[PDB]
Write a protein that binds this ligand. Structure first.
Ligand SMILES: Cc1cc2nc3c(=O)[nH]c(=O)nc-3n(C[C@H](O)[C@H](O)[C@H](O)COP(=O)(O)OP(=O)(O)OC[C@H]3O[C@@H](n4cnc5c(N)ncnc54)[C@H](O)[C@@H]3O)c2cc1C
Ligand SMILES: Cc1cc2nc3c(=O)[nH]c(=O)nc-3n(C[C@H](O)[C@H](O)[C@H](O)COP(=O)(O)OP(=O)(O)OC[C@H]3O[C@@H](n4cnc5c(N)ncnc54)[C@H](O)[C@@H]3O)c2cc1C
Ligand SMILES: CNc1cnn(-c2cccc(C(F)(F)F)c2)c(=O)c1Cl
Ligand SMILES: CNc1cnn(-c2cccc(C(F)(F)F)c2)c(=O)c1Cl
Lengths: 470, 467
C-alpha cells in the first residue's frame, strides 16, 4: 500500500543484496556506504597505471545457489569464468612440481570426488586413503543435525577422533582450512570443513570454481546499484554511520552520519562487519543476549598480495592453486584467469597471505620478501627472491586485520538471526545465521534473509510509522 | 474387574515393584511386603552419616531395555536417565593409565555403527583378529531364537574356540564383557548370555547405548513406583519379612506368615524374592515337583561393590562407564562426574564392581580396599598410589552380596521357571524367572510384567476360588 523506507548501513555484498531484494519487493532502500568504493571485502581500486588491486582473491563455487540466482537475475552469468573441474596443489617436498585432483565430468557426485582421490597417487598413500574414507563415511551420511554437533571440535581434533591420519590433516586439510577462513586446522571449527566438503557430495559441479571476469565494484557491485536505483532505491558513498540514535523506548530514532546528517526510515539494517557493529551498539542494547553473544565473533587478519612481473611466466595455470606453504594460502596468475586483467607479455600473481596475525603489523617490503621466498619454491626456475630471474615491476599489499569472523569452535550459537529483538532494527552480513559460511554466498544469502524478514514484518513496520506521526 | 484381586507379593525389588505396578494398572489390589527398611533389593542404596549415598551395585541402563524404557515413560521419569556418549571405553593393562575405545557413529545404523567401531579401533584388535572375530560371530548374529537357546550348552571360552575367534580376543574383549554381565569369567559363563548381550549391538541403533540413573535408586526410581501403586489402592510395607509359606490341606497357599507371626492372606500369592531365598522357603510338599526341584541349578553369584571418596577431583576421568580389564575389578565409574545427585566439583568418588568375588566376600573391608587401591594405581598411575602418596581416601563403603544374580553357567535355561507355578494361586517374579533379557534390571521389570499378566489371565479362576 505504502513502500517502506529502509536505511541500510554498509554496501558490501550483504547490504547490496538486502537493497536488491527490498527494491524487488517494491520498497525504498537507502544504502549508505562509509567508503568511496562498493563491495566491502570484495572492493578493488585502480592505481595510477590503470591496474586494479583487490581486497582479496575471490572464488565463486557451483555450490553457491544464491550467488547463481543473483547473477542470473541481473543477467551477468557470462561474467563468471568457470575453470576446469580440478584441485591443483603444490608439492612442498618437490619444488616446482604440482599434484591435482581431477573430477571426471562423466561421473556424478560424490563418485567424481572419490575417483579424484583414488586416481591421485602423490598426495595420499593407499592405507591413508582407506583411513580417510573410514573417518569421513559417517560424516557424509550425516544430516544437518550431525554437522551442527561438530561445531564443538577443531579440524585437527575431529580428524584424530575419526582416525583420519595426521599426515592427511597436515597435507590436505591445512590447505582447505587456510582457504576457507585463513587459519590452520588446529584452530578452525570442523563445522566449517563439513559445509565445504558438502560441495563435493551434493551437486555434481558444487566444487567447480569460477573467477569474476574483472574488478568486483564495476563487474558485480555496479549491476546491483543500477538495479536498485532503477526501482527507486538510493545508493550513497562516503556515508559512514557515526551513531545509532535511540528513542526513549529503546528503538532506533535515526542513524547519525559522520557529517552530522540524520537519516530516518521505517526500518533500519546494519550490513556492516560484526567488529564495526559491536563498537556502534548503543549502551542500552549491550546486555541483550543477541548483542552480548557477538563478543565471540572477532574478525580474522588476512593480507592480499599482488605482484606484477616483467616477464610472462612460462609455467602457470588458468586456475586457482593451493601453495601448501606455511606463509601463503591460495594464489592465481590473474593475467591468465581474469579477462579484464589479461596481459600476454606481463604476468601478475594475486596471493592470499594466511595466517596473517604476526604479519599485518609488518612492513610491505617485509611481506613482499616473505612472498618472494615462497614463490622461489613454487617457481624455482622462474622466480628468485633477489630478482635474479623474473623482476618485480610493482606490488600492492592490501591488509584486512579484521576480515571475516574467525570461525573457531562454538561460534554458531552466537550468530544472530537477521531479525533483531529491537523492533525495526535488522542485521545483514556473512557473520549472521545462514548455512553457507563467512563467504560471498553467505553475504548474499544473509541479505536475501534480511529483506525477507523486513517484508514479513511489513504490517507491523507500516503501523509503527503512523503511530509515531500522532 | 467385577471384584479386584488381593495379591500378596514377597519382595520389593524391581520384580516385586513391577508386579505391583502392573497389577494396580489392571485394577487389582497388590500388597507388596519388603523384608528390609529399604526398597529396590539388588538396586538398594543407603545414606550414611555425612549424607553420602552408597549402592548395592553400579547399575547401567541400556537402550535395548524396552520394558525399563516403558516403565520410566509410564511414570514420566525419562529425564532421570543420564544417557552417555555411544562409546565403550576400555583400559590398557599393558599400558598403565592409557585407555582404548569403540566409538559408535550416530549417523550409521545398527550393526554398521558397531562394525565401524571395531574397524576404527586399532589398539585392541589386529586386522587378522578382526577378520577371524567377524567370521566367528556372523553366523551367530544372523541366527534365530532357537539357535541362541542351543548355545546354552557351551561356555564362552568353549564356543569362541569352536567358531575360530582368536584366544586373545576372548581374553582381551570377552573377559571384560563376561564379568560385566554376570561377575564371572568366560570359562564359566554360558554363551547364551553373551549372545543376548551382543544382540543389543545389532537390533536397535542405540541398543548398546548406556545410561546412569541421576541419583540413588530407592528415591529416584523405587519411590515413583511406590507412589503410583499407593495412588491406585495398593499397599507397600517395609520390614515385612516372610518367615513361612503356610499351606492349606490340599497343598495351595493358606497365608504368608511374617517374622512377627502376622498372617497375610490374598486371592493370589507372588514370590518376587531372589531364587536362593525362595529355595529355602519352599514347603516340603512342593520340594519334589519338577518346577521347584529344577531351581537347585540356579545359585546366586558373589559380588562386591566398592565406593571410594578421594580428597582431590581426579584430572583424568570420564563422564562414562569404564572396563578396568583387571583380574580383580570389573566395570567402574567416577560417580562425581556421571551421577547428577552425586556430583561434586572438588571431590571425586569411584564406584567399582569387584568381580570374581568368590575368594573375596569372606575377606575384610581393609583387605578389599587394599586390593582395589593396588588396581587403581594401574588405572591412575600419576593420580592414585596404594600407600596414599598421591590422592588420599576420605572414606569408603564396601557392599558385599555373596548371593546376587543367579550364576549363568551352561544349562540353566531349562531350570528357569515360568511366572505361573503348578500351584494354583502361587506365582513367581524375579530376574531368574523365564524371560529373554538375562539376570538384569530389564529382566526383573519384564518378569514383573509377565507375572502380573499371568495373574490377570487367571482372574476368572482366582475370583471363583475366593468365594
Ligand atoms: C582475502 C579475502 C579472500 C576471500 N576469498 C573469498 C573466496 O574465495 N570466496 C568467497 O566466497 N568469499 C571470500 N572472501 C569473503 C568475502 O569477501 C566476504 O565473506 C563478504 O564479501 C562479506 O560480505 P559482507 O557484505 O557481509 O561484509 P563487507 O563486504 O565487509 O561489507 C560491509 C560494508 O560496510 C561498510 N561499513 C563499515 N562501517 C560502516 C559504517 N559505520 N557506516 C556505513 N558503512 C560502513 C564497509 O565499508 C563495507 O563496505 C574473502 C575475503 C577476503 C578478505
Ligand atoms: C553389583 C551389581 C551390579 C549390577 N549391575 C547391573 C547393571 O549394570 N545393569 C542391570 O541391568 N542390572 C545390574 N544388576 C542386576 C540387578 O540389580 C538385578 O538383576 C535386579 O535388581 C534383581 O531384581 P529382582 O527384583 O528380581 O531381585 P531383588 O532386587 O534382589 O529383590 C528381591 C527383594 O526381596 C526381598 N526379600 C528377600 N527375602 C524376603 C522375604 N523373606 N520376605 C520379603 N521380602 C524378602 C529382598 O530384600 C529384596 O528387596 C547388578 C547387580 C549387582 C548386585
Ligand atoms: C573467506 N571465505 C572463503 C574463502 N575462500 N574459499 C575457498 C576458495 C578456494 C578454495 C576453497 C576450498 F576448496 F578449499 F574449499 C575455498 C571459501 O570457500 C570461503 Cl567460504
Ligand atoms: C548383573 N547383570 C548385568 C550387569 N551389568 N551389565 C552390563 C553393564 C555394563 C556393561 C555391560 C556390557 F557392555 F558388557 F554388556 C553389561 C548387564 O548388562 C547386566 Cl545384564
Amino acid at each position: 500500500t505504502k513502500p517502506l523506507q529502509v536505511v541500510i548501513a554498509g554496501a558490501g555484498l550483504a547490504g547490496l543484496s538486502t537493497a536488491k531484494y527490498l527494491a524487488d519487493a517494491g520498497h525504498k532502500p537507502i544504502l549508505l556506504e562509509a567508503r568511496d568504493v562498493l563491495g566491502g571485502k570484495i572492493a578493488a581500486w585502480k592505481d595510477e597505471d590503470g591496474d586494479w588491486y583487490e581486497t582479496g582473491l575471490h572464488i565463486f563455487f557451483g555450490a553457491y545457489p544464491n550467488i547463481q540466482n543473483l547473477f542470473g537475475e541481473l543477467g551477468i552469468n557470462d561474467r563468471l569464468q568457470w575453470k576446469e573441474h580440478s584441485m591443483i596443489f603444490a608439492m612442498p617436498n618437490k619444488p616446482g612440481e604440482f599434484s591435482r585432483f581431477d573430477f571426471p565430468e562423466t561421473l556424478p557426485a560424490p563418485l567424481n570426488g572419490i575417483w579424484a582421490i583414488l586416481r591421485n597417487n602423490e598426495m595420499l598413500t593407499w592405507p591413508e586413503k582407506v583411513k580417510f574414507a573410514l573417518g569421513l563415511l559417517p560424516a557424509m551420511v550425516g544430516g544437518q543435525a550431525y554437522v551442527e554437533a561438530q561445531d564443538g571440535f577443531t579440524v585437527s581434533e575431529w580428524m584424530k577422533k575419526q582416525g583420519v591420519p595426521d599426515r592427511v590433516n597436515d597435507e590436505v586439510f591445512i590447505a582447505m582450512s587456510k582457504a576457507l577462513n585463513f587459519i590452520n586446522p588446529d584452530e578452525l571449527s570442523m563445522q566449517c570443513i563439513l559445509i565445504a566438503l558438502n560441495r563435493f557430495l551434493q551437486e555434481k559441479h558444487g566444487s567447480k570454481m569460477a573467477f569474476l571476469d574483472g574488478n568486483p565494484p564495476e563487474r558485480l557491485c555496479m549491476p546491483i546499484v543500477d538495479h536498485v536505483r532503477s526501482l527507486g532505491g538510493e545508493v550513497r558513498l562516503n556515508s559512514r554511520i557515526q551513531k545509532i540514535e535511540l528513542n526513549p523506548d529503546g528503538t532506533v530514532k535515526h542513524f547519525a552520519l559522520t557529517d552530522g546528517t540524520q537519516i530516518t526510515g521505517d526500518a533500519y539494517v546494519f550490513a556492516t562487519p560484526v567488529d564495526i557493529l559491536k563498537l556502534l551498539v548503543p549502551q542500552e542494547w549491550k546486555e541483550i543476549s543477541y548483542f552480548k553473544k557477538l563478543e565471540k565473533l572477532v574478525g580474522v587478519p588476512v593480507i592480499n598480495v599482488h605482484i606484477w612481473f616483467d616477464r610472462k611466466l612460462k609455467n602457470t595455470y588458468d586456475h586457482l592453486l593451493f601453495s601448501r606453504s606455511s606463509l601463503l594460502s591460495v594464489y592465481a596468475d590473474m593475467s591468465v584467469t581474469c579477462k579484464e586483467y589479461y596481459d600476454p607479455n606481463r604476468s601478475m600473481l594475486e596471493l592470499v597471505f594466511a595466517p596473517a596475525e604476526e604479519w599485518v603489523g609488518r612492513s610491505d617490503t617485509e611481506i613482499i620478501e616473505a612472498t618472494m621466498q615462497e614463490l622461489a619454491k613454487l617457481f624455482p626456475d622462474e622466480i628468485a627472491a633477489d630478482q635474479s630471474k623474473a623482476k618485480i615491476l610493482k606490488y600492492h599489499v592490501v591488509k584486512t586485520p579484521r576480515s571475516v569472523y574467525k570461525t573457531i569452535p562454538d561460534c554458531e550459537p552466537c550468530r544472530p538471526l537477521q531479525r533483531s529483538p529491537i523492533e525495526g532494527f535488522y542485521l545483514a552480513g556473512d557473520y549472521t545465521k545462514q548455512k553457507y559460511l563467512a563467504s560471498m554466498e553467505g553475504a548474499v544469502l544473509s541479505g536475501k534473509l534480511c529483506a525477507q524478514s523486513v517484508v514479513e514484518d511489513y504490517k507491523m513496520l507500516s503501523r509503527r510509522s503512523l503511530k509515531s506521526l500522532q
